[PDB]
Structures are given as C-alpha cells and as structure tokens.
Write a protein that binds this DNA or RNA. Structure first.
Ligand SMILES: Nc1ccn([C@H]2C[C@H](O)[C@@H](COP(=O)(O)NP(=O)(O)OP(=O)(O)O)O2)c(=O)n1
Ligand SMILES: [Mg+2]
Ligand SMILES: [Mg+2]
Ligand code: NA
Ligand code: NA
Length: 327
DNA sequence: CCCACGGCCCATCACC
DNA sequence: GGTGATGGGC
DNA sequence: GTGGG
C-alpha cells in the first residue's frame, strides 16, 4: 500500500513507540506500538475510524482512541506535549547515538547534557562505543547504496580468502535479499575446523587483515564469535571520501552455519513468519538450529543441515529465494 | 485480574 | 582479582 | 498496549 494511505497514523504510532522505548523505558509498549504500526501499514485501505482499525490484530482500545483523536484533530495532545518537553525530547534524541541507550540518555540529560555539542564537550563521560557513535553520528544514519555494498562485498570476500582459502563468508542481511540499499553490512563466517564439537584467532585473523588493508577503521566490540565495527571504502583521490559504515562479522560453527545464514538473511517479518510455520509442524528454529518439538514440547536434538533448503524441507515449505523473503 | 511479550554476545557495571 | 547483572545492539 | 490464560 502507498504510505500516504495511513502514514499519518503509522507516523504517530512509531513516534509513540520511540518515546516508550527511549523515555518511558517500557519495551513491551514500544513493541506494542510497532506491531500496531506494522499491521496498519499493510492495511490496503484508508482508515476512517478507530473502530475500523481495532479489527486489526495488535490494535486495541487505547490505540483506537488515539486514531479517533488524530482523525478529528490531525494531532495527539499527548504527542504534541512530549514533543515540546525539553527533557523527554532530548532523552529521545540522544539515543540516536549508537551506544547511547535509554539509560545513558537519561543520565546525560539529568546532568545537563542534552545535545551532540554537549556530548562533544564531555568525552570523559562517554565509553568507547559511544565515542565512535558520536564521531560518526551523521554517517551512521545514512543508508548504503547496493553498488557500494557490492564493492564492500568484493573487499571482504577477497581479504577473507587471502587469509585462508578454506574460510566460507556470506554477506547476509538486507543485501542478500537483494535490497537496493542497506543500513549496514552483515557478514557470516565459518571454517571447516570450527564446528559445534570444538582459534579464537579465526575471527581475529579476518578482522586484522581487513584492518591491515584499511577497510575496517574502528572497533565497537570484538569477541571470539562476534565482531562489531566501522568500515570505509577507499576513495578515488580526485573523488570525495565515502561515508563510514557499520559492519558486523559473525563466526559460526560449520554445522550451525546455514541456520545462521537463514536467520541473519532474515527479514524480521519473514523470520517470525517462518518461525510461526515451523512450530506448527512441531519444529523450533533459532539462529543455531532446527529442533523437533516433542510430545510435551520436548525440543530434542538439532537436525543435520547442510543447506538453507533442508530447513525449508523439514517444515514442508518450498525453498524461497532471499529476494522474496521480504515477508 | 494477571502474566507474556521471537533471542544472545560483548562491554561495563555492581558487588564480593 | 573474580562472578553475576545490566545496558546496548541487532 | 494488546492479547489471552
Ligand atoms: N534481533 C535480531 C537481529 C537480527 N535478525 C535477523 C533479521 C534481519 O533481517 C537480519 C539482519 O539484521 P539487520 O542487519 O539488523 N537487518 P537487515 O540487514 O535485514 O536490514 P538493514 O536495515 O541493516 O538494511 O538478522 C533477527 O531476526 N533478530
Ligand atoms: Mg543489516
Ligand atoms: Mg546488522
Ligand atoms: Na484488535
Ligand atoms: Na543508541
């Protein structure tokens, strides 16, 4: 559906969702509003009343009332008021800095720190991640055109094979679903010597090499299985520099890999829909495995999975191209 | 009336 | 020094 | 906030 169908309503709900997460610290209300926004966004008609909306699953009494007020006035008094509130709107804004959550934003605003400028003035109170988030605030809210993702993929797959030609690397996420732009880059990594029944160097080696060729520029977090950091394409000398980008690299056991690829190729909406169907034939699927639910819900042993397809087979669904896993 | 609300790794805090 | 809890991200 | 035991 076109966004201008009910965009006014969904904008309202998303903004409400944001204030619940960031200011009220009510995560389940945040998800409630999002779910409501999502189901309304998929609704193929212009909503004329809150009662009409209430028919949709996830839209209840309170949101129905909010829709009525919005339809009658073009606004929400509560939303209008919290927008004007310096404290609440500053708290809500600072959470856009990667590394600053509802709690940190709260503490900052409590002690007079409300803007990016104030953050820049008080580096002493920021942790490593927050400093990076601050330094690349602008860049991190930029999307990544597919053409750059391709170039980023070229570098990653090249350098990974250079380190060890037995590595397997896959760019997942919205890129693998064929999106024409992405928020970040997700890389899944495996190696024939790393399975469930098993360096910590395997992830480190790759990260280090990507640093050596000046692709990776910063590190947010780095463990033995998960890396989160910043990367940047090289410039053309004449041409102006590319924005810095967020990149995640996950090292996964060889025998948990194609569950990982499925999960982290995702679409959140597809994952939960494929979750949904999986439990209905008595299967539970997470990022690691697919397990048969038992006569009680006895989730037993992981089944063998050597491809994305096997997982589709288990729950009698035909293989869906990542291109179509929007939902 | 009352509880659940897809999950987990890493950095850092709280506390012994 | 350490273990467990919490914040944050995705 | 919504849904359901
Ligand atoms: N908590 C999480 C985090 C990620 N995922 C899955 C679904 C996502 O499509 C996939 C990758 O996560 P993601 O990077 O945050 N989203 P994605 O790459 O699809 O789109 P972008 O907004 O980054 O362009 O992992 C998930 O199912 N639950
Ligand atoms: Mg992504
Ligand atoms: Mg990601
Ligand atoms: Na409803
Ligand atoms: Na943030």
């Amino acid at each position: 559906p076109q966004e201008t169908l009910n965009g006014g309503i969904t904008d309202m709900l998303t903004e409400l969702a944001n204030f619940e997460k960031n200011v009220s610290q009510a995560i389940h209300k945040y998800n409630a509003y999002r779910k409501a926004a999502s189901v309304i966004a998929k609704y193929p008609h212009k909503i004329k009343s809150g009662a009409e909306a209430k028919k949709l699953p996830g839209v209840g009494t309170k949101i129905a009332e909010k829709i009525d007020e919005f339809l009658a006035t073009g606004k929400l008094r509560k939303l209008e008021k919290i927008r004007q509130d310096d404290t609440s709107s500053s708290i809500n804004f600072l959470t856009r800095v990667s590394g600053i959550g509802p709690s940190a934003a709260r503490k900052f605003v409590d002690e007079g720190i409300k803007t990016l400028e104030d953050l820049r003035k008080n580096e002493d109170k920021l942790n490593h991640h927050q400093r990076i988030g601050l330094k690349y605030f602008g860049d991190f809210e930029k999307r990544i055109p597919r053409e750059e993702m391709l170039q980023m993929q070229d570098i990653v797959l090249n350098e990974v094979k250079k380190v060890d030609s037995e590595y397997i690397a896959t760019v997942c996420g919205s890129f693998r679903r064929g999106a024409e732009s992405s928020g970040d880059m997700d890389v899944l990594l495996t190696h024939p010597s790393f399975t469930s029944e098993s360096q910590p160097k395997l992830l480190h080696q790759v990260v280090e090499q990507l640093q050596k060729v000046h692709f990776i520029t910063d590190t947010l977090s780095k463990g033995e299985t998960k890396f989160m950091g910043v990367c940047q394409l090289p410039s053309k000398n004449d041409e102006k520099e590319y924005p810095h980008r967020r990149i995640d690299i996950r090292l996964i056991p060889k025998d948990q890999y194609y569950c990982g690829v499925l999960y982290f190729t995702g679409s959140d909406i597809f994952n939960k829909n494929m979750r949904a169907h999986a439990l209905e034939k008595g299967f539970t699927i997470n990022e690691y495995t697919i397990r048969p639910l038992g006569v009680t819900g006895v989730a037993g042993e992981p089944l063998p999975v050597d491809s994305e397809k096997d997982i589709f087979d288990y729950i009698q669904w035909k293989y869906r191209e990542p291109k179509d896993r929007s939902e």
